Ligand binder design. Structure first.
Ligand code: BP4
Ligand code: PLP
Ligand code: PLP
Ligand code: CA
Ligand code: CA
Ligand code: CA
Ligand code: MG
Ligand code: NA
Ligand code: NA
Ligand code: NA
Lengths: 323, 323
């Protein structure tokens, strides 16, 4: 039916378990006091590499083949330089293969340093997509690598879904999961998993209003990507949903809550100050969603809500400017 | 025998357990790798009020009596706007009694607003130690209230010992606890508990070399308070050890590690960046200790080390200074 099944998610958990952390679920009286609800925080900010993306990245390295004639990937390649590129590089290191990040010439110096810091090799392209694609596909071919998309690659989606296997085990009375959405790999993997195992549990997406393609797509009933690059502090969810994640999200996600920039900022600072968790603002999106006006429409029967705190890769020394 | 015994800790546990968090113990691969040990982090930064001090404060509020006909305090009175005062204020809220803080009339508006935000009631004094004391005495008496010493009060020391009761359950094979020391209520409480329950477990203290009264005292075999108020980023450990905590520390604490300001800063930053925990610098003291050169020479038999992350009440709009 969909591009992954529950079986794929389980195969992913088996593939990655020896190398990832089974992150804790933490609680906060204050947040419980504030939102009306009984909250549980799945702490993917404590995951290896600082975000959940190691799950999909490692599953991809351990399950994808470069070619019909070669079973083992000989390198990994991606155009993502953020949490995905960091995760993929780490996954590549674990498997003893090189990682290449295709970066435009126009990338900030700090981004070029940060990539080299996490142990990947840089391959430069032009700012353009024609060049970007040329280069990545060319690097993939010449290194006998796998190209690993941050959110549309089935093995990546299946890996992200393992979060939900853990949550359902860690929080047996959970009523809903709240998941920040960008490309929807995490949302789709989680939705597949929850709906296979216990479909009475709600799956809710949380999204910046400033980048609201998932909302608009669900509203319209077809895939409606952002027409232009979004401006948002939630830097990890600037991707649009894509052709592999959209059908899952359409069919299996119960609702989508959008949140303003100010809501994202206030929820992030609330988590910092009141929970002492260094989440990145992108991980504040799910917290903002549960605090938002529209979340009050959620039935009072939906009491036990697990929010995925998806990452903690925040640049305290530079990024911080909005505080 | 001392101003408390383990019996007092068991009592405090029963007194307070229904109202405080049984904080988690977290781990970090990177910090294991940096120290060569198996580290366990007791997360008192997640405790109510943002530090462990609610333990001693609540125990004191639930066990001390006013100078009045009624056996229950009708108020709490403090000089502290810091971790101590915030802890006492929350304890008062739990008991449905007012918490008053005595504040010089020349306090900045920012401080006063900050004080009122956590729910304390300000009573003004003149800016002298004479006026501060006299106002606090008057308010305590007129309100049929109590005052609670931050580190020498037996009820506080006993409540602090409940940290170790949890650690010994959460980390059954623990070989040592590392505890930041100021007035030493937390250190003494912990030492009593550990030496009563599992005396083969080491109890190590950690303090800034800029405020090294605990180290000097243990070296000399007598209480040698700091000669002047120390300068340190570790605001919460500026107090010297006192007459009630010293005998316990003398007899029951195995060793004292001192750490420089730079070590404290670097340990605190390492915890933010690599563990995503927003500890205050005072809580970085214990981390700094386990990373320090002197600690590296500790016997390899002392493998499983629990560090108390004592607090997370850090001024976020003020971090820039040392970063
Ligand atoms: O202001 C505070 O909360 C700290 C504090 C509390 C009690 C005492 C005290 C000193 C001597 C005898 C009795 C109490 C000192 C300081
Ligand atoms: C990638 C990422 C997300 C969004 O995941 P998608 O699969 O792209 O929807 C959310 N939070 C963080 C921290 C991320 O790195
Ligand atoms: C009070 C405090 C300490 C020191 O406890 P003492 O009993 O005074 O030695 C350490 N860390 C934090 C965060 C504190 O608030
Ligand atoms: Ca290929
Ligand atoms: Ca979006
Ligand atoms: Ca000291
Ligand atoms: Mg498809
Ligand atoms: Na593991
Ligand atoms: Na695939
Ligand atoms: Na499960």
């Amino acid at each position: 039916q969909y591009d992954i099944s529950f079986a794929d998610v389980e195969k992913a958990h088996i593939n990655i378990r020896d190398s990832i952390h089974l992150t804790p679920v933490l609680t906060s009286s204050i947040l419980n006091q504030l939102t009306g609800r009984n909250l549980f925080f799945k702490c993917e900010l404590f995951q290896k590499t600082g975000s959940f993306k190691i799950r999909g990245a490692l599953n991809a390295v351990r399950s994808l083949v470069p070619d019909a004639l070669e079973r083992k990937p000989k390198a990994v390649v991606t155009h993502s330089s953020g949490n995905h590129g960091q995760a993929l590089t780490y996954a590549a290191k674990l498997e003893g293969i090189p990682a290449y990040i295709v970066v435009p010439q126009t990338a900030p110096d700090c981004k070029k340093l940060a990539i080299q810091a996490y142990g990947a090799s840089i391959v430069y392209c032009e700012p353009s997509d024609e060049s970007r694609e040329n280069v990545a596909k060319r690097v993939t071919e010449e290194t006998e690598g796998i190209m690993v998309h941050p959110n549309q690659e089935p093995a990546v989606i299946a890996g992200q879904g393992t979060i939900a296997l853990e949550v359902l085990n860690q929080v047996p009375l959970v009523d809903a999961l709240v998941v920040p959405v960008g490309g929807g790999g995490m949302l789709a993997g989680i939705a597949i998993t929850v709906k296979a195992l216990k479909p009475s549990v709600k799956v809710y997406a949380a999204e910046p209003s400033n980048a609201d393609d998932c909302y608009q797509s669900k509203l319209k009933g077809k895939l409606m990507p952002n027409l232009y690059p979004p401006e948002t502090i939630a830097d990890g969810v600037k991707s649009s949903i894509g052709l592999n994640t959209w059908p899952i999200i359409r069919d299996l996600v119960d609702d989508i809550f959008t949140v303003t920039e100010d809501e994202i900022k206030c929820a992030t600072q609330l988590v910092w100050e009141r929970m002492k968790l260094l989440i990145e603002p992108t991980a504040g999106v799910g917290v903002a969603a549960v605090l938002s006006q529209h979340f009050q429409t959620v039935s009072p029967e939906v009491k036990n809500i697990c929010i995925v705190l998806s990452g903690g890769n925040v640049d305290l020394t530079s990024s911080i400017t909005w505080v």
